[PDB]
Amino acid sequence: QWALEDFEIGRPLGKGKFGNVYLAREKQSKFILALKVLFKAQLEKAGVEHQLRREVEIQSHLRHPNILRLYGYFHDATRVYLILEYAPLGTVYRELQKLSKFDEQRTATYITELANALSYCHSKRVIHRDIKPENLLLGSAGELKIADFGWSVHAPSSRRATLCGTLDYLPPEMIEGRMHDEKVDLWSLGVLCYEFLVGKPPFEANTYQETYKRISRVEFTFPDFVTEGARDLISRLLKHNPSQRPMLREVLEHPWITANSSKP
Ligand SMILES: Nc1ncnc2c1ncn2[C@@H]1O[C@H](COP(=O)(O)OP(=O)(O)OP(=O)(O)O)[C@@H](O)[C@H]1O
Ligand SMILES: O=C(O)c1cc(-c2cccc(Br)c2)nc2ccccc12
Numbered sequence: 001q002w003a004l005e006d007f008e009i010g011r012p013l014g015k016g017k018f019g020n021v022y023l024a025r026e027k028q029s030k031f032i033l034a035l036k037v038l039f040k041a042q043l044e045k046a047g048v049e050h051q052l053r054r055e056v057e058i059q060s061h062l063r064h065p066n067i068l069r070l071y072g073y074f075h076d077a078t079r080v081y082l083i084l085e086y087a088p089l090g091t092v093y094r095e096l097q098k099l100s101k102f103d104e105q106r107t108a109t110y111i112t113e114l115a116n117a118l119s120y121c122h123s124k125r126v127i128h129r130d131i132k133p134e135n136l137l138l139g140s141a142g143e144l145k146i147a148d149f150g151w152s153v154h155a156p157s158s159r160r161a162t163l164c165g166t167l168d169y170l171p172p173e174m175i176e177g178r179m180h181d182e183k184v185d186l187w188s189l190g191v192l193c194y195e196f197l198v199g200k201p202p203f204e205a206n207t208y209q210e211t212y213k214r215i216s217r218v219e220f221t222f223p224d225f226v227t228e229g230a231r232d233l234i235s236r237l238l239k240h241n242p243s244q245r246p247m248l249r250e251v252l253e254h255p256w257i258t259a260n261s262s263k264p
């Protein structure tokens with residue numbers, strides 16, 4: 001249905017592991033979008049051609065405002081292109097670099113948006129598994145938008161791919177290879193909530209190795225400026241036992257969320 005010759009390419013919007021993402025416009029309609037280009041060679045070598053295929057299948061069938069739209073795809077002899085909705089305010093990663101840390105209002109708001117989009121996903125039994133500030137995009141109204149469904153799967157699940165990124169967001173059961181379900185996303189939600197208020201994820205280290213330890217032991221400590229209500233929500237999400245983590249309603253109605261989150 002599509003080829004490259006229908007789009008005017010522009011500035012690179014960003015980069016991740018397998019190829020750049022580019023601002024682009026559809027010549028006929030004048031639609032602005034983001035084009036995610038992946039090189040086939042690299043997807044063959046790293047053994048992740050399936051991840052990309054699911055990325056496309058899961059994501060195309062998802063309609064919620066706090067989730068990035070995939071409108072389609074096409075491929076060349078050497079490259080795969082995904083036609084994405086374009087997030088003009090960039091990433092939550094960049095915002096965190098500018099501002100160092102977020103206030104409780106911004107945090108509780110982002111968390112709210114997150115939980116909602118996760119509620120939606122978990123209602124179709126879909127787990128994201130890669131909730132990272134680099135994949136949380138900001139739309140024109142400043143609203144959060146989950147991107148990157150490369151790692152997303154149908155729950156429950158086991159890991160059949162060597163996660164070779166930072167483990168900062170991953171809970172114990174997923175690094176330990178052990179099975180897992182939608183509870184994985186609630187652990188990630190607490191790491192984010194920590195990182196937003198503190199700036200840095202709560203198990204950061206100069207090695208993957210120590211990061212593993214700290215995760216499996218659940219060793220985090222809060223700076224003095226984190227308030228009781230924030231501490232309670234974070235402590236409630238970062239439990240080793242996935243069964244003991246709350247439901248997404250319990251997040252949404254948590255006192256600290258309701259008092260700081262700015263709903264529509
Ligand atoms: N729709 C978009 N709007 C603006 N910027 C984007 C958009 N999509 C991606 N980017 C930029 O491109 C970067 C990498 O994109 P993305 O996470 O989709 O690719 P990836 O991590 O390499 O994919 P995957 O983890 O599925 O293999 C993002 O972190 C962001 O900075
Ligand atoms: O050579 C191919 O035909 C090929 C095709 C695709 C492909 C084609 C259409 C949609 C998607 Br998602 C992926 N992915 C690859 C990923 C890795 C290597 C090759 C491929």
Ligand SMILES: [Mg+2]
Pocket residue numbers: 016134135148
């Ligand atoms: Mg990414």
